[PDB]
């Protein structure tokens, strides 16, 4: 009986949540809240309209995260480090000696909490902490409260994406301010985000302002991407939140320019970064480079001093 208004509230809340948490709102907080409250009331009085990907999932539930030890479908990578220009030049020289001139993708390394996010038939069904890279903790219920994480992708794929969960600097500072006025302060946004995702109650996680950036996928089968940068664009089209500050560059001069630029611009960002990740862009060329015992030979994490 209430299908039209429920579908209308789904459509409006999903569009508004995307514009705010992924993109410029077209609507004030008061309008989002009013529509959210109305959907919550319909679902309380008519629970047959509840759905797995309802916008009301974002406020958190009674069901708690299990924190069960769960294996990733595919182990998560450990990156080798660079600490100066020389290290980047060595890494570039190792690659060009072996496979020739390559295009690099450069990305900001968010000072966040690494997660794997598993999608089955396009639905978000499992979110794990990175753990030891092989085994993680099940924090699905808490991750579901993060609006930047789609509950349902644009296409019904079976994929495991890798992301960095984080707390925006402004939200971190405002939280410590509330603590200062009333409690012990969090040391940094990373610790505040970790505290928020360790809650027994997802309703507590929901009242913290968290976001994510997706940086990779486990499996490129259902992707038409030939490169890391194309794969991130494809992820955008599928409904995920990626970091827009990535760049394709032709050579090591380009990589150095991007590091020097972001050294000077990192204070301007709304999140903490601890580095810059540089990767061979082409997927076939990443494959050609292969791995060491621990780490890809086609990627490196430059770390700020
Ligand atoms: N933390 C990370 C590990 C492996 C790859 C990437 C890409 N951006 N951040 C990454
Ligand atoms: N990450 C997302 C993808 C598509 C729609 C929405 C609404 N909130 N977050 C979304
Ligand atoms: N890592 C940090 C510690 C204390 C304050 C701030 C603000 N942005 N990042 C911060």
In a domain, 179, yes or no: yes
In a domain, 64, yes or no: no
**Could you tell me which residues are beta bridge partners of residue 138?**
128
Number of the ligand 2 atom closest to the C-alpha atom of 14: 7
Whether residue 138 is found in the same domain as residue 203: yes
User: Residue 109 catalytic?
Assistant: yes
Whether residue 217 is found in the same domain as residue 288: no
* 211 CA → ligand 1 middle, Å: 16
Resolution in A: 1.8
Whether residue 210 is found in the same domain as residue 150: yes
* 192 CA → ligand 3 middle, Å: 11
What is the C-alpha to C-alpha distance for residues 305 and 286, in angstroms, rounded to an integer?
Answer: 27
Phi/psi for 74 (5° steps) reads -140, 130
Whether residue 191 is found in the same domain as residue 292: no
For the CA atoms of 150, 153, 157, 158, the dihedral, rounded to the nearest 10 degrees, stands at 10
Q: Which domain, by its residues, includes 231?
A: 113-241
* 215 CA → ligand 1 middle, Å: 6
Number of the ligand 1 atom closest to the C-alpha atom of 109: 9
Q: Which residue has its alpha carbon closest to ligand 2 atom 2?
A: 150
Q: For residue 71, give both structure tokens.
A: 């294996």
* Nearest C-alpha neighbor of 255 from the set 79, 101, 76: 101
| Beta carbons within 10 angstroms of residue 237's beta carbon | 10
User: Pairing between strand 69-71 and 113-120?
Assistant: unpaired
Q: Which residues line ligand 1 (CB under 6 A)?
A: 77, 79, 107, 109, 114, 215-216, 277
Q: For residue 183, give both structure tokens.
A: 């409690």
In a domain, 67, yes or no: no
What sign does the CA torsion over 203, 171, 305, 276 have? positive
* 70 CA → ligand 2 middle, Å: 26
What is the C-alpha to C-alpha distance for residues 136 and 66, in angstroms, rounded to an integer?
Answer: 12
User: Residue with structure tokens 């780490």?
Assistant: 295
In a domain, 63, yes or no: no
Whether residue 136 is found in the same domain as residue 168: yes
**Measured from the CB, is residue 303 less than 6 Å from ligand 3?**
no
Among 69, 109, 144, 244, the active-site one is 109
**Measured from the CB, is residue 239 less than 6 Å from ligand 2?**
yes
**Measured from the CB, is residue 169 less than 6 Å from ligand 3?**
yes
User: Pairing between strand 81-82 and 299-303?
Assistant: parallel
* Nearest C-alpha neighbor of 37 from the set 64, 15, 12: 12
What is the C-alpha to C-alpha distance for residues 302 and 277, in angstroms, rounded to an integer?
Answer: 6
| Beta carbons within 10 angstroms of residue 55's beta carbon | 23
Whether residue 47 is found in the same domain as residue 121: no
3-state DSSP call for residue 220?
coil
Q: Answer yes or no: are the C-beta atoms of 60 and 141 closer than 8 Å.
A: yes
CATH code, domain carrying 29? 1.10.287.610
- Split into its structural domains, the chain has a count of 3
Q: Which residue has its alpha carbon closest to ligand 2 atom 1?
A: 150
What is the C-alpha to C-alpha distance for residues 228 and 244, in angstroms, rounded to an integer?
Answer: 13
| Beta carbons within 10 angstroms of residue 98's beta carbon | 13
């Amino acid at each position: 009986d209430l299908s039209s208004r429920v579908n209308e509230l789904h459509d409006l809340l999903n569009q508004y949540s995307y514009e705010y948490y992924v993109e410029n709102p077209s609507v004030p907080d008061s309008e989002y809240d009013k529509l959210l409250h109305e959907l919550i009331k319909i679902e309380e009085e008519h629970p047959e309209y509840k759905t797995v990907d309802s916008p009301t999932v974002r406020v958190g539930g009674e069901a708690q995260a299990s924190f069960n030890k769960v294996n990733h479908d595919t182990p998560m990578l450990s990156l080798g480090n660079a600490f100066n220009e020389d290290d980047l030049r060595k890494f570039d020289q190792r690659i060009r000696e072996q496979i020739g001139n390559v295009e690099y993708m450069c990305e900001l390394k968010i000072d966040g909490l690494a997660v794997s996010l598993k999608y089955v038939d396009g639905y978000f069904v499992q979110g794990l902490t990175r753990g030891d890279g092989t085994t993680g903790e099940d924090i699905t219920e808490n991750l579901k409260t993060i609006h930047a994480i789609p509950l349902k992708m644009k296409e019904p794929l079976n994929v495991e994406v890798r992301g960095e969960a984080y707390m925006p600097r402004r939200s971190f500072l405002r939280l410590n301010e509330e603590k200062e006025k009333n409690e012990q302060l969090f040391a940094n946004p990373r610790n505040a985000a970790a505290g928020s995702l360790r809650q027994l109650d997802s309703k507590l996680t929901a009242k913290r302002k968290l976001s994510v950036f997706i940086y990779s996928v486990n499996d490129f089968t259902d992707f038409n991407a030939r490169s890391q940068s194309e794969a991130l664009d494809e992820l955008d089209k599928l409904g995920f939140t990626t970091n827009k500050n990535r760049a394709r560059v032709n050579n090591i001069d380009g990589v150095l320019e991007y590091i020097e630029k972001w050294t000077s611009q990192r204070e301007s960002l709304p999140y903490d970064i601890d580095g810059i990740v540089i990767k061979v862009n082409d997927l076939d060329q990443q494959d050609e480079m292969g791995f060491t015992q621990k780490s890809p030979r086609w990627a490196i994490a430059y770390k700020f001093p």
